[PDB]
Amino acid sequence: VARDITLLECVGKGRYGEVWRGSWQGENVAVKIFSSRDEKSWFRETELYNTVMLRHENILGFIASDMTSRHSSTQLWLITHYHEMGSLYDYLQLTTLDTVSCLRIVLSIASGLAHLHIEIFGTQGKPAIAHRDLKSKNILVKKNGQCCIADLGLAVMHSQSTNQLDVGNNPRVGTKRYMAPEVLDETIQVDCFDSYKRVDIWAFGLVLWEVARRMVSNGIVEDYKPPFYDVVPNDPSFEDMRKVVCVDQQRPNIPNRWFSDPTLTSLAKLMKECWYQNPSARLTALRIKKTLTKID
Ligand SMILES: N#CCNC(=O)c1ccc(-c2ccnc(Nc3ccc(N4CCOCC4)cc3)n2)cc1
């Protein structure tokens, strides 16, 4: 419960709220305190962690939900494991990677995404889940080099047994930088569950690009950069994204030095197969996981 947690330092702040390192019984925990404008995401994520009972070594480990009243307002808390290395966005700016380190990160992310997408049938089986806002800032780096996925407030669920679709009721929109072309020009079929899985794939390809840039080969390595850093400004608008992703059909450039390394070359082909304008031509999360397991 919140009254037993000592907030020790703020490690994040934004439109979503803020993220704190706290102590509970003398050991670290992560507390996300949701902004007023993002209450729906707390409700959605509490449903997944509590009712569906989501857990997996590549999904941020849940501890508890709670409401606490403070300063004459009521706050919505989400308490989870603490990872001192921060998010992949922070980690990649402080270190380069070797071949084995680079492959763990991208294999563990694909392993997390596959768990979400795949339905487990039976008595109390988890439905299929699409994330819908995957990015490097809501993926965490664990001390064993593997990653885990967080920030599930936009998720959509599906069960083929009943074949009903639960899109929830959240006014939040995805991060514009990572938006997929069928989103930016409003052709995505909102009634078909596969549509949301193919959105996660597009975003996964971008994160794969972000990480591969940091792997060293033959003494060469790129600085960290976010997707489309060279053609859109910070906090880009819906219109900016569409000009780049739809009108000009642009994609993150493949650095030429990648073509003198066998791992980076196999990862480049995988990226491009996540980036088709035609959403149904993209690979599945399971396909990606399998391919990454055989690359070395
Ligand atoms: N933008 C955006 C959305 N991000 C999140 O919702 C989010 C971010 C982080 C965590 C989270 C979870 C567990 N542990 C941690 N640890 C953490 C440690 C260091 C940092 N720092 C980043 C800034 O500089 C100092 C290190 C951030 C998070 N974060 C959970 C949700």
Side-chain angles (χ1 to χ4, degrees), residues 1-2 4-12 14 16-17 19-24 26-36 38-142 144-286 288-293 295-296:
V1 56
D4 301 349
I5 301 174
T6 304
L7 305 186
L8 289 193
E9 48 170 327
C10 181
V11 299
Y16 58 98
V19 180
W20 285 79
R21 185 185 56 110
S23 282
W24 192 31
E27 63 196 326
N28 283 310
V29 292
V31 179
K32 183 174 189 170
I33 308 180
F34 280 73
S35 76
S36 193
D38 204 47
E39 289 191 340
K40 291 285 180 165
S41 295
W42 175 93
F43 275 86
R44 185 52 149 198
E45 206 152 7
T46 293
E47 179 180 14
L48 288 190
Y49 278 135
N50 283 99
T51 304
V52 167
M53 299 195 287
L54 190 74
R55 75 180 304 175
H56 184 267
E57 69 169 340
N58 300 122
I59 291 165
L60 179 57
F62 167 82
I63 300 193
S65 291
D66 201 0
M67 307 162 197
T68 192
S69 284
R70 295 162 181 233
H71 296 109
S72 301
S73 292
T74 296
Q75 288 183 356
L76 310 176
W77 285 27
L78 172 63
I79 303 138
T80 62
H81 294 137
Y82 185 67
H83 299 299
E84 80 197 13
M85 300 271 87
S87 73
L88 193 46
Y89 173 85
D90 305 295
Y91 186 79
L92 294 177
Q93 292 180 74
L94 301 180
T95 185
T96 63
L97 307 167
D98 64 6
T99 298
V100 170
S101 286
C102 168
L103 283 177
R104 282 193 191 117
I105 288 171
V106 299
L107 184 49
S108 57
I109 294 177
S111 285
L113 197 52
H115 182 77
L116 291 173
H117 285 185
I118 285 168
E119 178 172 6
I120 290 166
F121 305 86
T123 311
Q124 272 190 329
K126 82 168 210 63
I129 307 174
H131 181 296
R132 292 170 72 226
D133 199 13
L134 203 74
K135 50 176 168 175
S136 52
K137 272 187 181 137
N138 57 16
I139 300 163
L140 280 298
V141 186
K142 321 203 281 183
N144 58 14
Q146 263 176 65
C147 291
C148 60
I149 298 172
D151 182 30
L152 298 151
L154 213 47
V156 163
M157 298 186 280
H158 175 260
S159 288
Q160 79 171 16
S161 70
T162 198
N163 180 339
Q164 57 198 357
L165 177 81
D166 181 348
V167 306
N169 178 233
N170 195 340
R172 171 175 160 192
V173 307
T175 305
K176 306 208 169 50
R177 181 173 304 269
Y178 289 70
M179 277 195 175
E182 65 270 32
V183 170
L184 285 172
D185 66 17
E186 301 193 6
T187 57
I188 178 173
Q189 292 167 306
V190 296
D191 282 335
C192 169
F193 174 73
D194 280 329
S195 289
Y196 301 102
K197 270 146 69 189
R198 295 155 172 175
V199 165
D200 289 352
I201 299 309
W202 164 273
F204 174 95
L206 298 176
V207 174
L208 175 51
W209 180 84
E210 296 181 62
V211 167
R213 288 173 49 91
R214 299 296 290 152
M215 181 183 125
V216 181
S217 67
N218 307 309
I220 302 184
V221 73
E222 286 84 48
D223 290 352
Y224 170 81
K225 290 299 178 81
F228 303 111
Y229 71 103
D230 50 338
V231 292
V232 304
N234 285 302
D235 181 48
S237 76
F238 197 75
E239 198 173 314
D240 302 337
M241 284 330 278
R242 191 184 185 275
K243 169 50 160 51
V244 162
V245 165
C246 297
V247 167
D248 303 341
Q249 296 177 294
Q250 284 181 291
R251 305 292 191 262
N253 289 339
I254 306 292
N256 183 253
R257 70 105 176 176
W258 286 15
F259 283 107
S260 64
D261 184 282
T263 308
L264 281 167
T265 288
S266 293
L267 295 179
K269 180 170 152 69
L270 203 163
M271 289 178 220
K272 289 190 163 282
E273 306 199 279
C274 298
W275 290 338
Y276 291 123
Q277 183 176 308
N278 171 7
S280 70
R282 291 166 204 165
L283 299 185
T284 65
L286 195 56
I288 301 183
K289 185 187 182 174
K290 293 180 178 177
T291 292
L292 286 168
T293 299
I295 288 177
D296 56 355

PDB file of all heavy atoms in Angstrom, residues 226-238:
ATOM      1  N   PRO A 226      16.784   9.082 -32.255  1.00  0.00           N
ATOM      2  CA  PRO A 226      15.428   8.546 -32.342  1.00  0.00           C
ATOM      3  C   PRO A 226      14.991   8.439 -33.791  1.00  0.00           C
ATOM      4  O   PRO A 226      15.630   9.015 -34.685  1.00  0.00           O
ATOM      5  CB  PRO A 226      14.594   9.586 -31.582  1.00  0.00           C
ATOM      6  CG  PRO A 226      15.331  10.868 -31.825  1.00  0.00           C
ATOM      7  CD  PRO A 226      16.799  10.505 -31.872  1.00  0.00           C
ATOM      8  N   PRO A 227      13.915   7.707 -34.067  1.00  0.00           N
ATOM      9  CA  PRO A 227      13.462   7.567 -35.455  1.00  0.00           C
ATOM     10  C   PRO A 227      13.092   8.914 -36.059  1.00  0.00           C
ATOM     11  O   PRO A 227      12.477   9.763 -35.409  1.00  0.00           O
ATOM     12  CB  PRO A 227      12.242   6.645 -35.342  1.00  0.00           C
ATOM     13  CG  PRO A 227      12.417   5.936 -34.031  1.00  0.00           C
ATOM     14  CD  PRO A 227      13.103   6.914 -33.131  1.00  0.00           C
ATOM     15  N   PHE A 228      13.488   9.105 -37.317  1.00  0.00           N
ATOM     16  CA  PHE A 228      13.121  10.276 -38.104  1.00  0.00           C
ATOM     17  C   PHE A 228      13.686  11.568 -37.529  1.00  0.00           C
ATOM     18  O   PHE A 228      13.172  12.654 -37.811  1.00  0.00           O
ATOM     19  CB  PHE A 228      11.598  10.371 -38.246  1.00  0.00           C
ATOM     20  CG  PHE A 228      10.982   9.151 -38.870  1.00  0.00           C
ATOM     21  CD1 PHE A 228      10.184   8.302 -38.123  1.00  0.00           C
ATOM     22  CD2 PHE A 228      11.233   8.835 -40.196  1.00  0.00           C
ATOM     23  CE1 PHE A 228       9.626   7.168 -38.690  1.00  0.00           C
ATOM     24  CE2 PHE A 228      10.679   7.703 -40.773  1.00  0.00           C
ATOM     25  CZ  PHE A 228       9.875   6.867 -40.018  1.00  0.00           C
ATOM     26  N   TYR A 229      14.755  11.460 -36.736  1.00  0.00           N
ATOM     27  CA  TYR A 229      15.373  12.630 -36.122  1.00  0.00           C
ATOM     28  C   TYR A 229      15.769  13.680 -37.152  1.00  0.00           C
ATOM     29  O   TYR A 229      15.870  14.866 -36.821  1.00  0.00           O
ATOM     30  CB  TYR A 229      16.606  12.198 -35.330  1.00  0.00           C
ATOM     31  CG  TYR A 229      17.748  11.766 -36.222  1.00  0.00           C
ATOM     32  CD1 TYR A 229      18.837  12.599 -36.442  1.00  0.00           C
ATOM     33  CD2 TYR A 229      17.730  10.532 -36.857  1.00  0.00           C
ATOM     34  CE1 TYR A 229      19.881  12.211 -37.263  1.00  0.00           C
ATOM     35  CE2 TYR A 229      18.766  10.136 -37.680  1.00  0.00           C
ATOM     36  CZ  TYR A 229      19.840  10.979 -37.879  1.00  0.00           C
ATOM     37  OH  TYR A 229      20.876  10.590 -38.697  1.00  0.00           O
ATOM     38  N   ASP A 230      16.014  13.274 -38.393  1.00  0.00           N
ATOM     39  CA  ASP A 230      16.580  14.182 -39.379  1.00  0.00           C
ATOM     40  C   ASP A 230      15.537  14.910 -40.222  1.00  0.00           C
ATOM     41  O   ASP A 230      15.914  15.776 -41.018  1.00  0.00           O
ATOM     42  CB  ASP A 230      17.533  13.417 -40.305  1.00  0.00           C
ATOM     43  CG  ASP A 230      16.912  12.148 -40.862  1.00  0.00           C
ATOM     44  OD1 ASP A 230      15.954  11.637 -40.245  1.00  0.00           O
ATOM     45  OD2 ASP A 230      17.377  11.660 -41.915  1.00  0.00           O
ATOM     46  N   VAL A 231      14.249  14.600 -40.075  1.00  0.00           N
ATOM     47  CA  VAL A 231      13.253  15.168 -40.981  1.00  0.00           C
ATOM     48  C   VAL A 231      12.052  15.742 -40.237  1.00  0.00           C
ATOM     49  O   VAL A 231      11.193  16.392 -40.845  1.00  0.00           O
ATOM     50  CB  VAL A 231      12.803  14.123 -42.016  1.00  0.00           C
ATOM     51  CG1 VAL A 231      13.944  13.807 -42.968  1.00  0.00           C
ATOM     52  CG2 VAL A 231      12.315  12.860 -41.319  1.00  0.00           C
ATOM     53  N   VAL A 232      11.971  15.515 -38.930  1.00  0.00           N
ATOM     54  CA  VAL A 232      10.898  16.117 -38.138  1.00  0.00           C
ATOM     55  C   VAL A 232      11.500  16.775 -36.909  1.00  0.00           C
ATOM     56  O   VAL A 232      12.603  16.417 -36.461  1.00  0.00           O
ATOM     57  CB  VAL A 232       9.826  15.075 -37.736  1.00  0.00           C
ATOM     58  CG1 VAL A 232       9.254  14.387 -38.967  1.00  0.00           C
ATOM     59  CG2 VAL A 232      10.397  14.069 -36.746  1.00  0.00           C
ATOM     60  N   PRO A 233      10.804  17.742 -36.329  1.00  0.00           N
ATOM     61  CA  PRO A 233      11.289  18.405 -35.118  1.00  0.00           C
ATOM     62  C   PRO A 233      10.885  17.626 -33.869  1.00  0.00           C
ATOM     63  O   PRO A 233      10.202  16.606 -33.932  1.00  0.00           O
ATOM     64  CB  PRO A 233      10.599  19.767 -35.178  1.00  0.00           C
ATOM     65  CG  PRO A 233       9.294  19.469 -35.852  1.00  0.00           C
ATOM     66  CD  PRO A 233       9.561  18.354 -36.835  1.00  0.00           C
ATOM     67  N   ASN A 234      11.323  18.134 -32.716  1.00  0.00           N
ATOM     68  CA  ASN A 234      10.912  17.559 -31.441  1.00  0.00           C
ATOM     69  C   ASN A 234       9.412  17.748 -31.235  1.00  0.00           C
ATOM     70  O   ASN A 234       8.825  18.747 -31.657  1.00  0.00           O
ATOM     71  CB  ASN A 234      11.684  18.205 -30.287  1.00  0.00           C
ATOM     72  CG  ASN A 234      13.115  17.714 -30.199  1.00  0.00           C
ATOM     73  OD1 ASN A 234      13.368  16.518 -30.056  1.00  0.00           O
ATOM     74  ND2 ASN A 234      14.062  18.641 -30.285  1.00  0.00           N
ATOM     75  N   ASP A 235       8.796  16.776 -30.574  1.00  0.00           N
ATOM     76  CA  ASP A 235       7.346  16.768 -30.366  1.00  0.00           C
ATOM     77  C   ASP A 235       6.643  17.000 -31.698  1.00  0.00           C
ATOM     78  O   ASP A 235       5.891  17.967 -31.855  1.00  0.00           O
ATOM     79  CB  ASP A 235       6.939  17.814 -29.338  1.00  0.00           C
ATOM     80  CG  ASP A 235       5.449  17.823 -29.080  1.00  0.00           C
ATOM     81  OD1 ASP A 235       4.879  16.735 -28.866  1.00  0.00           O
ATOM     82  OD2 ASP A 235       4.852  18.919 -29.080  1.00  0.00           O
ATOM     83  N   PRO A 236       6.873  16.138 -32.689  1.00  0.00           N
ATOM     84  CA  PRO A 236       6.337  16.395 -34.028  1.00  0.00           C
ATOM     85  C   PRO A 236       4.823  16.259 -34.070  1.00  0.00           C
ATOM     86  O   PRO A 236       4.209  15.570 -33.251  1.00  0.00           O
ATOM     87  CB  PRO A 236       7.019  15.327 -34.890  1.00  0.00           C
ATOM     88  CG  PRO A 236       7.275  14.207 -33.936  1.00  0.00           C
ATOM     89  CD  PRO A 236       7.625  14.872 -32.629  1.00  0.00           C
ATOM     90  N   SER A 237       4.225  16.937 -35.042  1.00  0.00           N
ATOM     91  CA  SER A 237       2.780  16.970 -35.189  1.00  0.00           C
ATOM     92  C   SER A 237       2.298  15.834 -36.084  1.00  0.00           C
ATOM     93  O   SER A 237       3.063  15.237 -36.846  1.00  0.00           O
ATOM     94  CB  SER A 237       2.330  18.313 -35.766  1.00  0.00           C
ATOM     95  OG  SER A 237       2.591  18.385 -37.159  1.00  0.00           O
ATOM     96  N   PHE A 238       1.001  15.542 -35.973  1.00  0.00           N
ATOM     97  CA  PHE A 238       0.362  14.592 -36.877  1.00  0.00           C
ATOM     98  C   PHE A 238       0.722  14.887 -38.328  1.00  0.00           C
ATOM     99  O   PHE A 238       1.046  13.980 -39.102  1.00  0.00           O
ATOM    100  CB  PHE A 238      -1.154  14.644 -36.679  1.00  0.00           C
ATOM    101  CG  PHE A 238      -1.885  13.459 -37.235  1.00  0.00           C
ATOM    102  CD1 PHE A 238      -1.846  12.233 -36.592  1.00  0.00           C
ATOM    103  CD2 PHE A 238      -2.621  13.573 -38.402  1.00  0.00           C
ATOM    104  CE1 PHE A 238      -2.527  11.141 -37.108  1.00  0.00           C
ATOM    105  CE2 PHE A 238      -3.302  12.488 -38.923  1.00  0.00           C
ATOM    106  CZ  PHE A 238      -3.256  11.271 -38.276  1.00  0.00           C
TER     107      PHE A 238
END
